[PDB]
């Protein structure tokens, strides 16, 4: 109540990074020149959804330990409001303590977003059956996100770093099976009295 944990996360891409474009008008405006545009801001910066990555990472790893953590993965599921991901990332009756910012890049599109040419090759003829263009964020591109945790316990730091190593192992964004989105995280943590604006 009197303290907030602040987690300044700086993430740098060790691989091509694709997350999908979300806005319908931006997608349909860039479904002509490219067929898989990446998520952009209107300030032309790349957005990555970060909360679901951490929440999924924590839920798989905590079900692996056998803790009684729920799963908000299946269709129309229920946060039980009693687990440690339910305490951290929220339930339907209570909000999440860890407010997780979007992964905001420090560069714009012409510096990190590149169009591409992805293919589908016939197995017998060894010829390109299909061609489609898709934007990606380059390797070495770096992004920032601030995770702010109100009412901190002892183990929020360890769970958030553990989720970040799981995100490094799996990837973040889309096309994760093709090698996209493999990144590296750096974390600067700081304890905060909530009244520092006064």
């Amino acid at each position: 109540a009197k303290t907030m944990k602040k987690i300044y996360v700086t993430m740098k891409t060790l691989s091509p990074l694709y997350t999908g474009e979300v806005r319908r008008e931006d997608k349909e405006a860039a479904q002509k020149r490219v067929n898989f545009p990446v998520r952009k801001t209107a300030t032309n910066k790349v957005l990555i959804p970060f909360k679901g990555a951490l929440r999924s990472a924590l839920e798989i790893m905590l079900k692996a330990k056998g803790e009684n953590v729920c799963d908000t993965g299946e269709s129309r599921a229920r946060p039980c409001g009693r687990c440690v991901t339910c305490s951290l990332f929220g339930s339907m009756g209570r909000a999440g303590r860890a407010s997780v910012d979007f992964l905001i890049s420090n560069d714009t599109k012409e510096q990190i977003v590149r169009e591409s040419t992805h293919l589908r090759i016939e197995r017998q003829t060894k010829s390109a059956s299909d061609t489609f263009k898709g934007e990606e964020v380059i390797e070495g591109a770096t992004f920032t996100a601030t995770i702010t945790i109100s009412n901190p316990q002892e183990k929020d730091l360890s769970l958030i770093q553990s989720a970040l190593k799981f995100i490094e192992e799996n990837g973040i964004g889309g096309w994760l099976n093709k090698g996209y989105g493999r990144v590296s995280f750096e974390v600067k943590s700081e304890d905060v009295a909530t009244d520092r604006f006064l």
Binding site: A29, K32, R33, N106, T108
Partner: protein
């Protein structure tokens, strides 16, 4: 980093022989001056000069003032000569006249978002080195960068392509298409909806390009059905099924004929046709 106004110093955020330790601060007498130490600097705010003062023990920065010989005497007799002196609190011409003499003793002066050059030529005209340049100042949200007309050319061409590929000739505006009864349209679009040639994305795209006029729908269905000269590939989704090669072509022809025959039906009529297939629109 000193910000001139008095004298502000941002390390602790202090603003200007025993030692008070706040940032090691220590006041020597001017005959008073203050020597501040920080990990990034050993600054000296001298104040004015009067003849045998008390210079500190390395004064990395020496922020002095004068309005002439005594300034330079104090510029010497200080062990480990400063990196950069700062000439403040005086008339500009006298500051430059002193400053020429601090350059003659080989010591650098400076008389009182990050900005990035994305430029590339040089000229040695007059006392200063230069390169003439006409350009652009972009003000991104954490940078301010400098570009030339090649970058303006590239974003101008991107804007031209994005604005040309945005408005067609006679869309949403006001013949010789095929004709076929409603029952065969039912049977054909059911059959071409179970196997995936007419899928919900394709019915939806037919709905938008029909709402944008008949000719927009004719153009869309032709460019979906247009077989390429080189690959021999049409922009339909392949039917899921055994269909060997020729009823593939007759089946794409059936999709062509059924959509083109549905074009001259009434807008409410093609709506009552399509929502059984794609509930959205």
């Amino acid at each position: 980093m000193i910000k001139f106004i008095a004298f502000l110093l941002e390390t602790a955020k202090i603003l200007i022989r025993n030692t008070i330790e706040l940032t090691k601060i220590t006041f020597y007498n001017n005959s008073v001056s203050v020597f501040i130490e920080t990990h990034n600097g050993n600054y000296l705010f001298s104040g004015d000069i009067g003849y045998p003062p008390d210079m500190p023990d390395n004064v990395d920065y020496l922020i002095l003032e004068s309005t002439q010989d005594e300034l330079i005497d104090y510029i010497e007799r200080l062990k480990y000569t400063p990196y950069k002196v700062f000439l403040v609190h005086g008339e500009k011409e006298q500051r430059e006249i002193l400053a020429k003499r601090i350059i003659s003793k080989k010591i650098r002066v400076e008389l009182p978002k990050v900005v990035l050059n994305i430029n590339t030529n040089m000229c040695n005209f007059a006392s200063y080195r230069l390169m003439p340049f006409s350009g652009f100042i972009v003000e991104k949200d954490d940078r301010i960068e400098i570009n030339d007309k090649n970058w303006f050319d590239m974003i101008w061409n991107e804007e031209y392509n994005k604005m040309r590929s945005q408005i067609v000739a006679e869309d949403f505006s006001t013949m010789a298409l095929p004709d076929m009864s409603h029952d065969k349209i039912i049977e054909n679009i059911e059959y071409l909806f179970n196997i995936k040639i007419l899928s919900k994305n394709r019915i939806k795209e037919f709905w938008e390009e029909f709402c944008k006029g008949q000719k927009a729908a004719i153009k869309y269905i032709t460019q979906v059905h247009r077989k390429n000269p080189n690959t021999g590939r049409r922009n339909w989704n392949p039917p899921e099924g055994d269909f060997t090669d020729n009823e593939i072509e007759k089946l794409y022809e059936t999709a062509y004929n059924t959509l083109l025959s549905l074009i001259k039906y009434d807008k409410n009529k093609v709506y009552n046709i399509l929502i059984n297939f794609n509930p959205k629109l």
